[PDB]
Each structure stands twice: as C-alpha cells, then as structure tokens.
Amino acid sequence: RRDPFDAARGADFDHVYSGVVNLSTENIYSFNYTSQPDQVTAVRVYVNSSSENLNYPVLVVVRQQKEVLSWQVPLLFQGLYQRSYNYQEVSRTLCPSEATNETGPLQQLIFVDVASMAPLGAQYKLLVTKLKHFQLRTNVAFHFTASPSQPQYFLYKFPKDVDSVIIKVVSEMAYPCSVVSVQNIMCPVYDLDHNVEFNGVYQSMTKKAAITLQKKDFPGEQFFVVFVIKPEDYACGGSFNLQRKKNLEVTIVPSIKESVYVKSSLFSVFIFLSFYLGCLLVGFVHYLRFQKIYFWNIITIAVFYALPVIQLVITYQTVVNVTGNQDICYYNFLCAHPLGVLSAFNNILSNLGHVLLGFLFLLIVLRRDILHRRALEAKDIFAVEYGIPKHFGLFYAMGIALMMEGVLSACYHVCPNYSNFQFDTSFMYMIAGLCMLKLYQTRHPDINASAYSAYASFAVVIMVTVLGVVFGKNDVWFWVIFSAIHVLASLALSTQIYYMDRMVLLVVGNLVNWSFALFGLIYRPRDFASYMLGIFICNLLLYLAFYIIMKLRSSEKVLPVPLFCIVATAVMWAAALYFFFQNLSSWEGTPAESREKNRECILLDFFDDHDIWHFLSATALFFSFLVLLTLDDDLD
Amino acid sequence: RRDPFDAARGADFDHVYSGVVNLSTENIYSFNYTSQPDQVTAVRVYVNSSSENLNYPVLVVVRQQKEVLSWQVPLLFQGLYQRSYNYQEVSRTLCPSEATNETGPLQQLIFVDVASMAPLGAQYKLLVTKLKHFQLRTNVAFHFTASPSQPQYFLYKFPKDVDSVIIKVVSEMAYPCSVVSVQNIMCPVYDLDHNVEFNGVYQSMTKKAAITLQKKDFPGEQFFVVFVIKPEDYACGGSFNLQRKKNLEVTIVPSIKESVYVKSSLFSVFIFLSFYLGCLLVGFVHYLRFQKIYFWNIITIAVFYALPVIQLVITYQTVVNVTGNQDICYYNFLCAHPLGVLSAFNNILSNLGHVLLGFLFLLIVLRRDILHRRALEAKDIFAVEYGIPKHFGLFYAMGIALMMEGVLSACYHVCPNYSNFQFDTSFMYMIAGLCMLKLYQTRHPDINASAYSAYASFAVVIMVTVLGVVFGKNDVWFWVIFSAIHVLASLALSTQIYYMDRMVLLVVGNLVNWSFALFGLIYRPRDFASYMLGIFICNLLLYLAFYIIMKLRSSEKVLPVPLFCIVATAVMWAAALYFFFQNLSSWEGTPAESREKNRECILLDFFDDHDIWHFLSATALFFSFLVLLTLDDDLD
C-alpha cells in the first residue's frame, strides 16, 4: 500500500517548488504547521503550469484533516456564443480552523498531491504561503487583487459594542464584473463562480459596492467576506498570457446610532410644523387688526393607484428581506438606513412635507371659502361690479393631489424597480394640469369642460410615456411621431389661447422649437417620465409668467404678499431643480452600473440629494399654489 | 517519487472492495475500459464507510484524463436553526465522453484513491459499476431512486423529426423536496445542492414536474437531465441510520404540431361567430315576417387599471424568458403551449368570448335603442299607458365592462402571480353591481344614484379583498368584523328593498346566515376574491329569481324568448360554476405545491378546465344580460 510519509517531501512554505509529471509519477508534499490561541492562520496555494498543454491538464489535490479540494491548472472557462478561455495560473485559500484557550495549541498537517496523465510530461510550479493579511479591522482600508481563477476572501470579527457595520468595496476600473458575498464561519466556503450565490447576501459590482450587516444574525460575531471575478461581462453591461486582474479596496465602518434617528425625525417634524406656527401667528395678527365631482374622482383614483403598487412593494420587500439577494431593489446603498423590516427608512420619512403642506393648504383654502360663503350670505355688491366669480373645488383637488403624490412617492421609494418608474412624480402631472386649468378659468369665463378633459389628457400622457419607455428605447420613428404630435399640440394650444401681446405665441412656439432641436440633437434622454415632468413644469412656469406680465401691463398694483410668494416660488423652484438634476441610482441599466453612481449622504448623517429634492418639491409646490390663490387679491 | 502503476491495484467493476485506512496508508485502484462509437458509457462510484467517525472522515479522490472529483464519505449537511445531519453513503456519476467514428475506439483509465487521517484506522467499502440505463428514449417511462447524497442524471438525444419535447417527473410521497434541471452536454455537470441552479432551466418539485424544451437552443440536440434531492423541506413546504430515499418516474414526450394551433384558433373563432350568424338569421326572419358619463368613466378606468399590470406582466415575462427559472409564474405547466415569446398561449386565446360576446351585446342594444328612438320620433301613445321608461346607458356600460374584463383576464393570465390575484375576475364585480342596479331601476322609478355609488362600493370591496388576502390570512378578528359588516349590509339591503312577499326578506336573511355558518365553520377559503365572486353571483341570482317569481305572481304571460334565455342562462351558469370549482394551480402556497395539482388538458389537445370556465362565464353573462334586457317585452 502507498506510504505518504515514505514518499512525502517534508517541505516548507514560501519555497517555489518545481517539477515535471508523467503518467506513472505523482508528487506529494507534506506541509506541517501549528496554530496558537487568539490567532488565525490561512494557508494559500498557488500553482502555475508554465506549459500550455491543454489535452492533459495537471491535476492538483489538497488534503487536510476534514476537507479535500481538487482542481486543474489550465483552468478552462466556457462563455456564451461558444467561447473558451484558458487560465494558466490557479490559486486557492484553505478554510481556517480556530484555536481556543480550552483547546490549546493545535498541530496541523496538509498533503498536496500533483499528478498528470501526459504521456511525455507536464511541467508545474507549486508555491505555498502563510497569510498575515487575513483578519480585517474596522475603519482601516485594504488593497488587493483578484482574478477569474484566483478568488479571494478574508475574515472579520465583531467588536464588543458595535451592533451594525457597513462593508464598502471600491475599485477604479470597472472592465470585468465582480461578486462580493458575506458568509458565516462554517467550512466549506463557496468561493467559486457557480456556487458563490448559494448562501449569504451577495452583490454584483463593477466600480462600487456597499453591504449593511447586523450582529444578531451571525452566531459567533464573525464572518468571511468573499470576492470573485467573472470570466465575462455580459451580466453587468457590455460584452466580454490571459489574465483579468482586478484591484480592489475594502473598508468596514460601524453604523450610526439611534440618536441619529431621533434627531432626524424631530428635525423633519419641526421644520414643517414651523409653517403651521407661522400661519397661526399671521391669522392671530390679522384677527388683532380686525379687532364636487373631484372628491369621489380623487378617492377612486387614489385607491386604484394605491392597492396594486402597495401589494407589489409589499411582496418585493418581503422577497428581498427573505432571499437576501441585494439586486432587486434599486436603492442607494451608501445612505440607506433600515428600521425594522424597512430597508430604506430615510427615503420614506423624507416625505412628511408632501402631506403636511398639502393638509395645511387644504385647511387654509377651506377657511377662506367658508368665510367667503358667509360674506356672500351677508351679501355685498362690492364683489359684483368690483368682484369676480369664485370657485372652490379646484384648490381642494390640488391639495388632495399633493397628499396622494406624497403617499405615492413613499410607496414607490419603499423599493425602487424598473416596473415602478411612475408613481414617483405621476401626480405632479395632475398638479400642473390643475394649475393650467385654474389659470385658464380665472381670466376667461368659466366654460368648464366638466372635469374629464384633464383625466383624458392624463391617461393619454401616461400611455405615451409608458409606451415610449417600454418600446421607444432604441427606436426613432416613435420619437419623430411624438415630436410632431407635441409641435401640433403646442400650436393648437397657442391658437386657442390667443382667441401688444401678439408675439407671445411666437415666443412660446420658438421656445418649444428650440426644445425639439435640443433633444433631437441629444436624442437620448432615456427617461421619458423625467422629460414629461420637466416639460409640464416649463409650460406651467411660462404661462404663469405670461399672465403676470399681462396683469402688470393692465396697470394694476400687485399686493405685497403675492409678490413675496412669487419670489419664494421662483427661488424654491431653483433649489428643487438643482437637487432634482442630481442623479443617484437609476432603474435603467444593469444593477451593477446603477450602484456605480452613489453618494454618502449630506446635510445630517441621514439624508442625501433625493430627500432634499422631496422637501424642495413639496415646499415649492405649496408656494406656487399660494401664489395662484392670492395673486388676484387686489382685484377686490 | 510516487508511482501510480507500482501501487495500483488493477481492479474490476461490480466487486465490493473492502479496506481499512490509517494515517500512513492510502489505497489506489486503476480501473480501465474502452468506449466504442455509437455508445455512451457512464461509470458510477459508490462509497460507504461503516464507521461513524466524524472527526476523521474518509476522503475519496477520482481522477480521469481531464477532470478531478473529490469528497468525504460521511457527508455533512447543515440546516437552518443550527441543525446537523450526516450521511454514511455516497454515490457519483462521472461525466461521459462520446466516441465518434472518426475518433474510433477510445481507451480510458480512472484512478480512485481512498485516504484518511485517523490515528487508528477507518473502514471503507468501494463499488464501481458501468451504466446501461443511461440514455433515455421517447415515450418510454423510467423508474429510479435518489438520495440527498446520491444525485442522479441521464442523457437524452433529439430524434430526427421531433422539434420540441416535454419532460414529466412523477413521485408518490412528497416528504423530501427535489430539483430537476436540464443542462447542455459540456462537462462538468452541476449535480450538487449548492450549484444545481447555476446553469440551465430548472424546477423545484415534490410530486410533479413538467418542462418544455425546443431544439434550436441546444447544439448537438442532446441534453442532460439532473435530479437532486434536498436535505430539508423548508423551501418546498413544511419543516424538515439516516436516509431520505425518494423514488421517481420520468417520461419524455414529443410536443404537439402547428395543425393543433390552426384547429384551435379556427374553432375558437367560429364557435363565437356562430352567435352573430344566428342573430343575423333571426333578424332576417323577423324582417321577412314584417314584410354619457359611463363612456369617460370606463375609458379612464381602462388605462388606470391596465397600464401598471401590463408593464408588470411584460417585465415578468421577459425575466422568466431570459433567466430560465420556472418558479416565478404560477402556470399550469402540464398544458401550456407557447407561441413566439408567449409562454401560455392557450390561456390567452381562451378569452375571445369575453370580447366577441360583449361586442355583439353592444351592437344589439344599440340597434334596439336606435329603433326605439326612431319609433318615439314617430311617436306612439301605446308605450305610455302600456309602456315603461327606457334607458340605454346601463346596457352599454355592461357591454364595455365585459369587453374590458376579457382583456384584464388575458393580461392576468400572461403570467399568474401572487401579486395579480385580482384582475382575473375583478370587473365582474362591477358587472354584478350594475346588473343589480339595472334590476332595481327597472321595477322602481329612476331615482338615479348617479353612477358613483357603485364606484365607491367597488373601491371599498377591492380594498377589503386586498387587505383580507394580504393581512387576514391567519387572523380571526378581521374575519369577525367582515362577517358583522356583511350581515349588517344584508339587513340594510333587505330593509331598503322591502320598502304575499313578506317572507322573501326572511329567506334572503336566512341564506346569508347560512353562508355565515358555512364559512365560520370551515374557516378556510383562503381565497377572498373567489368567495367575493361567489357571494355576488349568489345575490344576483337570488334577486333575479325573486323578481321573476313576483312578476309571475302579477298575472302576466312571459314571452317565449325570456323563458328560453332564462333557462339557457341557468344551465350555462351551472356549467361554468362546475368548471370553476375545479382547481388547477394556485398562487397561494409554494411553487412546488402549486404545480402538485395540474392536469393534462381536456377537450381538444389544446384547452383545459380554466379555458372552459372562461368560455362558460362569457356565454352565461351574455345570456343573463339578454334576459335582463328582454324580460319585460310583454309590458308593451
């Protein structure tokens, strides 16, 4: 029978052994070592076959007390479209074994067998090294490299007090993909291409990655972090001595404390309770000085838009929570602080304004309407010769639209996905439509088109946006059709509005023409919903400015409050647009690329660009509504 | 250096070799054979270690020309909640290699090394066999067994003419879960728990599995079918010498031809064009004898309900088509014949009735209304003393509702899922509500409650169904509240309708209480939408019967047409209810259990139970609408 010790070459690490193997010869090495308490050892084996022989690859086997590994040196990889890759270098890190005080020091023996089947002979170069850069320390950076045939991994231990940590991985060149996984301390460790996704959370990456971990999940308060390269780049983006070495840097930082949650929530509540305080103060000062269809329509639409997306987000959140695959939701992982089951608490709590400001506007408008109704009950002719008809439903509809938009944005931000590009700014389409209708009706007679012209316009707009995003991704015929339809609609609107100021239609048409030229040259927004939002905002602002200039030309004085409101609306729009243009993550594109553009929070230690965008959108909409309501106070 | 031949024990298959291994002793066998053209050989290795030694397992390494395998005898499996299992027998199949005529006969060697590290020694029994039942033949069954540590797989080759095949796997005891995968002929083959899902299509199963495969995808027209058992049953259902042998039977059958498609399409079209032909002939015979809000409401609701579901289903279908994981959509896999990109073409084409019947009903109602308007233009006092008010909006609303329900059902059936449990029969809620409203308006005066009473009722009903299904899965308080609310609603409806026939209110209340007791003693429908449909159908039929019997008590003769329509409606309703009670697949429950109840098609070789339910529902609803419209002909 075979004797290992007899033929075993008592060897030592760090020595570059060389040899040649025939059909009737096997080489065996018998490395030995010891492990002491409080320290972790991780041997690593490198094998390079200088020869390129492929019909008789070298076979390598590693044996320990309780594990066996085996592979080939000329590693062969198969890729789509019948492509073959051959790597002539291989490496592997053996699973470590802890040594406690009770166990004491432990002696370990490792057998390495190299054998081939080539009739003539195959060369091989073997190397074995200990690892000193194995453990990881919080807040301390680290650099290394990996390859398709050289997967890597390291260990981390949980400090005494830290209850949550964040692992951030950064590269420079995103040519080949990579996969980063986290696993418990239980050998074996699946650091291979086809089994790295079996266990533990994992993330695809090309230039950035971030993973948040708790402490109660892991027994023993330790875990292994595994990095694996991929032979091909199809999954992450474009197409695909052969090597693909990738340089990586990994950092681990403790997470924030609940004090951040308390401070952020209190600040968010009070910053917008201040508006109610100011409104009550102004009402008190004024009192001292003095000393229908929309309702059911909006309720039905709210339920219709709420139930389906709400169930969808519930299911998606549950699935991502259970499976542990962080590639379904298009979060911004750099700043996404979870609470309970919720994974992104900030992006939802940053929606308080879209509700509070809307409810305040509802309250103020209702009070004004009730006061006017009581005054009319008392009767006064001053509002006939020196007054104009008053309407109420439009403002309530605007406010309820604002509340529903806030709730829709929250539900959408629960878990972003490519199937939810709308529901984020859909109701601001209605808000702009209501503003346009209010402006049309205030000047010209009522001539109400009931209420369903706006609903038809909204449905058509949504249909066009969805069809363009789903199908007009790479086509241009649909783009030409949409451009022609937009130009025709603009011309028709100008003609209808027209019937000293004869050049206003020309100005608006020329602006829109510059717009078509702009994106015809650009011809690649790739986000139809964002443009629809922008164009509706443009039209709203242009029409408001035109009406204000017309009123000024009419030789009347604007009350100071509407003037201040208009200026505040302009500045708030400026800030909100600045924050909106900032892009963090995007549903379009592979999840590897979407995370590539992330940022590490601004303002407090909680919020980022999108939250400030929510805040500015809410406040700017509130002030625009106030401008619309209070502009014509001087007429009475 | 070590010498394999010097220590090689030239062995033979089918002999149970026995041995004992120490730290310094490892045994090696050198099996040898030859493969001839037109035959496939697949060795198989069984290793059993009698001892239970866990600290010092026996390590086995198998070496071939171009591959290396390795494992331990006492295989260890880790399961959730910190559970450990050990299996003392292992088996494996070595990847075969074809031998072409040009290549000629090929000699092959296989080295099996058994080595351990126990200080004293461990026993081992080794068996190596050839495989004769490796290839699979079309339409021929096959029986075998698998174990968590003994995965299996076989080869299949595409016949000359077969262009698509179906693989069906059947078991008897659903205790241990299983996975069935299909892969291309390119070694290695992933038949392990942690890497079986990496490549090729696959399906989880407990009692039944079915997979459909084309020909152009596979180069060489061959593929491997791999069956792998799982240590625990958490994924596919409930909770978890040790052994979990599972017996399986496999069948492979060629798929249908396009003539089936042509036959099914022609039959589906002409069965429902027959109704138009018959109506035209009836009108011909009659001629020879003679010789607004709803529109906008429904158009808005159409887009409002459709766009999100359409986009979601498009994304789901694309992802399932590309990724190849057949566990997202809850199809009925046994009879799902795909066309182009669509995966279940039959379940979509089976909705033609919901549109054709609706269109015919709208045409007929419009014709009748137009001739009535012409007659009124000519004027006739007969329809005053012996006439009743005539309305038109409700019938068009019903027709449009049917036409929209057809598209909603099609969109839902594109890919059923737990997030689309509605949209399969949701619009028929409104259908029943509008039928109820029409009946109420017919006898009593107009007293129109506009149209939004039904809108609010539908929104509230959908909200209740959603919150019950998503939340009320396991709770009883919500069920008690719902029962109380429904009893109160029944009492209120009875009181309102009441103000010879003094006992009908008691009868309806008692029927409601009987349903109460039924679902309070069963306490397990677990399908809120289904019971909502049942209850709407029940009250609709009850009111129809009450009205018809009251009309009978009024001493007037009904025209033969209403009698024929009522009888046909009753019969079609019974048939549709029967076909509805049949259960094929279900979104609730794991995908393994959903497929456990599937059936192999009825009628032609295309359609099955659910399609028949669609047909019957369409026809029965059309006849019910006709009954309502033509019931009161005798009055004039």
Ligand SMILES: *[C@@H]1O[C@H](CO)[C@@H](O[C@@H]2O[C@H](CO)[C@@H](O)[C@H](O)[C@H]2NC(C)=O)[C@H](O)[C@H]1NC(C)=O
């Ligand atoms: C085995 O490997 C050796 C290369 O080291 C070669 O065989 C050797 O041949 C020389 C010259 O005849 C002998 O002196 C050695 O004793 C042989 N050693 C062995 C291990 O065979 C050859 O490359 C391989 N064997 C064959 C048959 O090719």
Ligand SMILES: *[C@@H]1O[C@H](CO)[C@@H](O[C@@H]2O[C@H](CO)[C@@H](O)[C@H](O)[C@H]2NC(C)=O)[C@H](O)[C@H]1NC(C)=O
């Ligand atoms: C296999 O090939 C690689 C690369 O050709 C060898 O890696 C070299 O290692 C030395 C050691 O410092 C470096 O100076 C060289 O720069 C490395 N090569 C390259 C291309 O950078 C490796 O030594 C060879 N053998 C083994 C067993 O890995």
Ligand SMILES: *[C@@H]1O[C@H](CO)[C@@H](O[C@@H]2O[C@H](CO)[C@@H](O)[C@H](O)[C@H]2NC(C)=O)[C@H](O)[C@H]1NC(C)=O
């Ligand atoms: C090696 O296996 C054998 C069990 O068969 C044991 O060692 C044997 O001991 C006897 C008595 O001294 C010798 O005659 C044999 O030559 C030994 N065989 C070998 C292979 O060493 C023992 O279980 C194992 N070795 C040790 C050191 O325990």
Ligand SMILES: *[C@@H]1O[C@H](CO)[C@@H](O[C@@H]2O[C@H](CO)[C@@H](O)[C@H](O)[C@H]2NC(C)=O)[C@H](O)[C@H]1NC(C)=O
């Ligand atoms: C390992 O153990 C298994 C059972 O634990 C042995 O399998 C037996 O195989 C024979 C061969 O026909 C059957 O008659 C027995 O019924 C099987 N055992 C049982 C419990 O049913 C097997 O022989 C052992 N060794 C190997 C190498 O498999």
Ligand SMILES: CC(C)CCC[C@@H](C)[C@H]1CC[C@H]2[C@@H]3CC=C4C[C@@H](O)CC[C@]4(C)[C@H]3CC[C@]12C
């Ligand atoms: C009523 C209005 C104000 C609510 C608006 C936000 C809604 C959509 C939020 C508030 C609370 C949230 C829920 C809180 C907890 C969980 C449990 C988790 O396992 C699934 C998601 C689920 C069920 C959340 C879904 C989203 C949710 C329902």
Ligand SMILES: CC(C)CCC[C@@H](C)[C@H]1CC[C@H]2[C@@H]3CC=C4C[C@@H](O)CC[C@]4(C)[C@H]3CC[C@]12C
């Ligand atoms: C406009 C909205 C976002 C403003 C905030 C209101 C709602 C959504 C907030 C207020 C209080 C919040 C809850 C507070 C505490 C918990 C318990 C935790 O285990 C799950 C989440 C859950 C249940 C939160 C979900 C979101 C919540 C319901």
Ligand SMILES: CC(C)CCC[C@@H](C)[C@H]1CC[C@H]2[C@@H]3CC=C4C[C@@H](O)CC[C@]4(C)[C@H]3CC[C@]12C
């Ligand atoms: C970001 C992508 C989707 C493109 C959207 C562009 C939008 C947000 C931008 C581009 C052109 C801009 C407009 C250009 C000119 C004017 C006239 C000015 O008197 C009021 C503001 C207004 C109306 C701007 C508002 C913001 C605007 C509409």
Ligand SMILES: CC(C)CCC[C@@H](C)[C@H]1CC[C@H]2[C@@H]3CC=C4C[C@@H](O)CC[C@]4(C)[C@H]3CC[C@]12C
């Ligand atoms: C004409 C009126 C409407 C303008 C008021 C809105 C202002 C604040 C908007 C309009 C266009 C916007 C800019 C568009 C593009 C850029 C370039 C980018 O690298 C930094 C932000 C910056 C500079 C934006 C900041 C905000 C911005 C200046």
Ligand SMILES: CC(C)CCC[C@@H](C)[C@H]1CC[C@H]2[C@@H]3CC=C4C[C@@H](O)CC[C@]4(C)[C@H]3CC[C@]12C
């Ligand atoms: C015109 C009305 C009646 C059509 C009603 C059926 C609808 C839902 C059907 C008709 C055509 C179908 C599409 C045909 C082909 C594909 C390509 C596939 O990669 C994604 C799904 C998609 C895009 C289908 C989605 C469902 C679909 C849109």
Ligand SMILES: CC(C)CCC[C@@H](C)[C@H]1CC[C@H]2[C@@H]3CC=C4C[C@@H](O)CC[C@]4(C)[C@H]3CC[C@]12C
């Ligand atoms: C459910 C009701 C509304 C469907 C009635 C409309 C029929 C004619 C529609 C619905 C879905 C359609 C199919 C959708 C997708 C494809 C795949 C493509 O490669 C060929 C055309 C084909 C096969 C379409 C033919 C027309 C089609 C069958």
Ligand SMILES: CC(C)CCC[C@@H](C)[C@H]1CC[C@H]2[C@@H]3CC=C4C[C@@H](O)CC[C@]4(C)[C@H]3CC[C@]12C
């Ligand atoms: C199938 C699941 C959801 C359970 C519900 C079953 C439903 C559809 C069943 C159970 C009780 C049944 C009703 C029992 C009694 C009557 C009165 C009769 O004059 C007409 C049929 C009618 C109205 C039945 C229609 C079908 C019905 C409503």
Ligand SMILES: CC(C)CCC[C@@H](C)[C@H]1CC[C@H]2[C@@H]3CC=C4C[C@@H](O)CC[C@]4(C)[C@H]3CC[C@]12C
């Ligand atoms: C005509 C109107 C009043 C409907 C009358 C109700 C009839 C048609 C319904 C009520 C209960 C139903 C039965 C309930 C259960 C089963 C068992 C199943 O294995 C076959 C169908 C069968 C036998 C159903 C057939 C249809 C059925 C008999």
Ligand SMILES: *[C@@H]1O[C@H](CO)[C@@H](O)[C@H](O)[C@H]1NC(C)=O
């Ligand atoms: C190395 O020395 C012997 C030789 O294999 C071995 O038995 C022992 O356990 C090892 N001890 C240390 C300290 O490495």
Ligand SMILES: *[C@@H]1O[C@H](CO)[C@@H](O)[C@H](O)[C@H]1NC(C)=O
């Ligand atoms: C082992 O002893 C060292 C001695 O300082 C101590 O620091 C360490 O905490 C001990 N570990 C255990 C597990 O007892």
Ligand SMILES: *[C@@H]1O[C@H](CO)[C@@H](O)[C@H](O)[C@H]1NC(C)=O
């Ligand atoms: C078996 O015989 C020898 C012994 O190993 C081997 O070299 C040869 O290739 C084999 N021949 C056949 C016909 O199996």
Ligand SMILES: *[C@@H]1O[C@H](CO)[C@@H](O)[C@H](O)[C@H]1NC(C)=O
């Ligand atoms: C090999 O020869 C046999 C002889 O009958 C024939 O049937 C088979 O088709 C041939 N195969 C090839 C690939 O030539």
